[PDB]
Symmetry: D2
Subunit: 331 residues, 4 copies
């Protein structure tokens, strides 16, 4: 006899399991930018947020819920407990430890391993069949860590890797050429961040190879200094941090694009971090970015890119370094 | 010649004005949430940001630019100087000071007036024919201030007003009824914030009046205490602030919804703040929220909601209160 | 090795059961309009088309496939055999025979029943747990027929019903009032087509009831003859047929809106046809339109609209006529 | 006081012009496929339709209007008279005879040139600053014709050209490689018709050149016979026409893709019909497809593709064929 009862007749109460649920672990600037971008792209019928800071977590959940009128994602939930993440198709990890001043790489990585040791088994408990997308840095090593802890098959553990680096590269390329980034093609591969590799041979507009038109492209004898574009990719990341104190929007949008391919089974190709053992004379269990076909099974295939000697040596050097760190990790 | 000349043959030099340009003034959490939501809804062909904090502004601009690959807004600019905002169709003001410890309400209002005294003339100078959308608080007073300083006609000066209040109300309504907020209709009008008025007579699902079904709706004798739903709207605002320190996602989404109606000339009805002199016995130059028709020329029409005597007296009290503050203001 | 094997390294060979699949049965003007609208709203990860005309079916499939670059639906299939429809979440039936000159109600219906006797069991064989959305006319009877043949529970059998009727009504309302139809609320219920019932008490803008401002609303003595709006809804149908020979675009869009609620579990309220036995003194198994909550389990709840005495009698008269035809159908 | 006056208080009247008006000439299968695709991409604030068949025209207009609740384009108009098209930003021409089974698009010249002689002056009369987008066949020849008749600068006269052939090519490529067409890059240039040219040398995935991996690619000695893919592109329209009588959906999507770049000033690269005088030693005023940068001024730049000697020969042969036809036209 309540108002709801007067107004609404119920036919059935049954089931109700999310069909396209996504979880974001960690609700810092990066996690929440991933969340808003995913929400505005209608990728999920349920979004779950997890963090260890409970106040912050509740506030972010409520803020998103309050915009429900303007969205098409009918259920947004959160909690410190992983039961809220049950039955996720895709779980995106942005949680981790921030590197201290003077702190060694091994030490920082070890701190994040200890964090993943709590996070990953809980994610797996509640969504045994999800794809894991790792955003946390250092992304290539932490993708390895998530893979190691989860026990997932290689296809279901994806690192955001060089996706953002490549998007920045295409923005800068577009600016130089006066063309939309969508029509400017180019690939930054290997280790995410400072050591990434710009594959000059693949840079093209409408299938016209820039390297072929301009053989000095990428080299030190290039009067147009196209090498500076890749340098600006690296520099701009530290610049944004210096200017606003963190980065969020671009990473959020790039993560949503990966999630789109995965959730809708598109099988588009993105530069993301995957287990690269067997390529480029790499014989250790290390993850680096190559172009990968992404769909409902995660990474079902990868593209074998022909690299120059110098490009190959750079990936190989990254692989040697990552393994040097990984082999000393305590799981 | 240059690589660019080898690759591209130019037919046309003469660039043109952006035709659907939007500016956001103030790049705090609210401003940037407005920005990301506007970008992901493809409402503008050029977006400008303005603020007085130069480093923050550049970093926000760059972060958005870096996501350009995933967007359809070909130009993002920013600057302290308002020449970057030239020819904006719509200018959204989210700039404001935060009330300090020990600071009176009147003194806070005056500080925001002093900020508008600098912002408004600059906006008007570069976009004399734009629509102004005021979000800064107290929004009803600052919308009056923008109107007064700009010398714009009332149709082109629009306050966010009770747009967010109403969205929260409908989210809460939807939760109670188990229906999507899009299908739960209800209007919160009058003075934005603590003094807003839930118009019980208009609350409905499928044109079925909740108040006709449940006569006690919105009263103290309401067995179900639906009054609490409005109370929760106001409570939730302070709770989000207590939990995450500010609010962003919901207001940003709601502002973008307004921007969509205006930019696309939709003539949808939204609860926004408008000059209401001559209504409900109000005879002063004050702005309050009623349902307004939004389109290309801003507020072309407003819906005259039938209000109960009690409801009318509340708006009247708000009007008296607002005018009493405005008459003491120093322009 | 093949060029493919040289380019791409495979991690694993698929292949999941369809996750978000929609089938459209009948690729006439209505079926294809549904298909293009569903494709452009990104509602499905797989679309299947079925018809009995094999060249037409294949050509339509190919035409859509050729636009794959512009879409986000990676798999489009078709066939006379229902094996192509397997594991559909939602199956939309637009198949029917066009009514002949000088053919009774009972005989046109019987022709479509004979069609359904073949279609329905095939659909059920390959997607035993799908939701069925019936569009074929007369839609209220054929929804009952699909319900009886399929053996599905009532929540999983939905008729488009008065969805299109209400969309036309709101377009006409918006034209009169100079407001977007999204903001012009009004419900046409009961039997689809000639005998539908415009519910005057629910017609409102911003929660302001027109019936309360204008008591004569929808009566004979109404100086503004608002009854003519509903008359125009009915006349519109026949005029479009007269003018272009069939209708496609509006019905296509309205159906895709229903699919959106179902595929995305939105729980929005739509006017669709559902099993109405138990309401308004209706004691026969008939399907009439009321506002229903649509989500992942089809119709989970319906809204109990308060109807006047005359409104109720019109529904009952419809139920009687519908049952009178149904009790004579040979299954 | 009428009901509207009771319900709505007007602030100001006076009609405003649309900001983003699009006209479609011809409401045949192609015209209406363009219309629905453009409406569902929210590209226009006004859509105008023109045809010589007056009832069909009214019927198609009404059918779209009835779908308004589901669209974000507030005004749709139609008329035999070109006054309905005034102030259009973009005018799309789809009127005219279409090829029948086994008939060449080149067999349509006399018919369609005659029709253009009436259409083009009318369009230019009412929208002197519009971009013209030509779709009618044979599209390259009719783009030249529209150019000559209108007296527009060539940047503002665009033929839909090979955007669709390239889309078909990429669809077929993606099917062979198991990758989404978006990630498969390959260009088909020249005549939208039998003499189109597949640019093997530019085909790639993730910047990896398929020709470098597979030197025989596209030649007669290709063990995988990739030339058959281009052959399928050439035969595409014929097959679809033989099956369903005409093509519509793919071209509708292609046209909307072009219209999006134009209306939103994206500066994306598309192969469209334009004047290629000055490229590849061509001295004639011939129109055919090469990659162009598309934006608010139409075609602002051409991308200069480096063709192999064999590719260049085929393109010049295409140009020879088309110019032989164009040059005989009398105005
Ligand atoms: N792969 C890429 O291209 C990029 C990666 N990143 C990385 O993304 C990560 C996050 O970025 P920010 O949001 O700025 O950092 P943040 O520190 O502001 O946010 C991290 C959140 O994770 C939470 N967290 C910590 N331990 C947790 C646990 N055991 N369980 C659940 N949550 C926990 C924290 O409470 C915090 O809220 C960083 O590692 C950053 O370096 C950032 C930009 C680009
Ligand atoms: N109408 C509504 O429903 C809501 C309104 N608000 C209001 O939005 C306003 C801002 O929100 P927040 O982003 O949290 O504030 P914030 O303090 O974080 O950001 C404000 C920005 O305004 C800038 N600013 C100050 N003076 C300026 C000037 N003279 N020119 C240009 N920029 C200037 C500041 O530098 C700062 O970046 C506040 O007034 C707040 O109350 C917030 C939520 C809801
Ligand atoms: N509920 C509503 O508001 C509306 C309903 N409709 C109804 O939609 C239906 C279709 O309309 P149109 O597309 O214009 O008719 P149509 O005649 O052009 O298309 C019918 C298609 O169904 C096919 N079909 C016939 N038997 C079949 C079978 N046994 N299996 C599979 N396919 C079969 C036909 O081959 C044909 O392709 C009609 O019943 C029409 O009245 C139309 C408009 C609105
Ligand atoms: N560029 C491309 O890739 C494609 C081009 N086409 C071409 O598009 C054209 C149209 O095809 P459909 O729409 O299928 O033909 P349709 O026969 O379905 O419709 C054509 C319309 O043009 C109208 N029309 C004729 N003369 C007119 C005039 N003087 N003014 C205004 N309207 C006039 C007709 O009345 C008719 O409604 C054909 O030339 C066809 O070959 C078709 C598919 C693809
Ligand atoms: O853009 C950032 C912020 C960076 C960061 C953060 Cl979030 C916090 C403190 C310091 C840094 Cl460098 C973390 C990170 O990986 C990136 S992407 C990046 C970094 C270096 C070179 C190239 C690229 Cl594309
Ligand atoms: O939700 C917020 C944050 C609030 C705020 C801010 Cl931004 C900063 C400091 C304190 C406060 Cl309360 C400013 C504001 O107007 C709102 S909306 C609101 C506020 C009170 C009652 C009802 C509503 Cl719908
Ligand atoms: O708009 C049409 C075309 C109509 C039709 C067809 Cl598809 C073919 C031949 C004749 C007719 Cl009437 C089939 C139909 O149900 C509708 S909707 C409708 C019909 C009557 C009154 C009100 C409405 Cl909203």
């Amino acid at each position: 006899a309540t108002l709801k009862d007067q107004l609404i007749y119920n036919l059935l109460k049954e089931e109700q399991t999310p069909q396209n649920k996504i979880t974001v672990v960690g609700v810092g600037a990066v996690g929440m930018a991933c969340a808003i971008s995913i929400l505005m792209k209608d990728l999920a019928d349920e979004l779950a947020l997890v963090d260890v800071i409970e106040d912050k977590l509740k506030g972010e959940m409520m803020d998103l819920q309050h915009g429900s009128l303007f969205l098409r994602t009918p259920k947004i939930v959160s909690g410190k407990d992983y039961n809220v993440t049950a039955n996720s198709k895709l779980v995106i990890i942005t949680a981790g430890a921030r590197q201290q001043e003077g702190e060694s790489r091994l030490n920082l990585v070890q701190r994040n391993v200890n964090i993943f040791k709590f996070i990953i088994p809980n994610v797996v408990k509640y969504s045994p069949n999800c794809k894991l997308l790792i955003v946390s840095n250092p992304v290539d090593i932490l993708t390895y860590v998530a893979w190691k802890i989860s026990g997932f098959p290689k296809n279901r553990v994806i690192g955001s890797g060089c996706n953002l680096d490549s998007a920045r590269f295409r923005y800068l390329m577009g600016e130089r050429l006066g063309v939309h980034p969508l029509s400017c093609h180019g690939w930054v591969l290997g280790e995410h961040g400072d050591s990434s590799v710009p594959v000059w041979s693949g840079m093209n507009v409408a299938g016209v190879s820039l390297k072929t038109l301009h053989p000095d492209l990428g080299t030190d004898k290039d009067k147009e200094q196209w090498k500076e574009v890749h340098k600006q990719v690296v520099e701009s990341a530290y610049e944004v941090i210096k200017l606003k104190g963190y980065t969020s929007w671009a990473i959020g949008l790039s993560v949503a694009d990966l999630a789109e391919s995965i959730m809708k089974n598109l099988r588009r190709v993105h530069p993301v971090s995957t287990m690269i053992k067997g390529l480029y004379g790499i014989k250790d269990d290390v993850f680096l970015s190559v172009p990968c076909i992404l769909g409902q099974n995660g990474i079902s295939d990868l593209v074998k890119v022909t690299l120059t000697s110098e490009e190959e040596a750079r990936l190989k050097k990254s692989a040697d370094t990552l393994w040097g760190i990984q082999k000393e990790l305590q799981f």
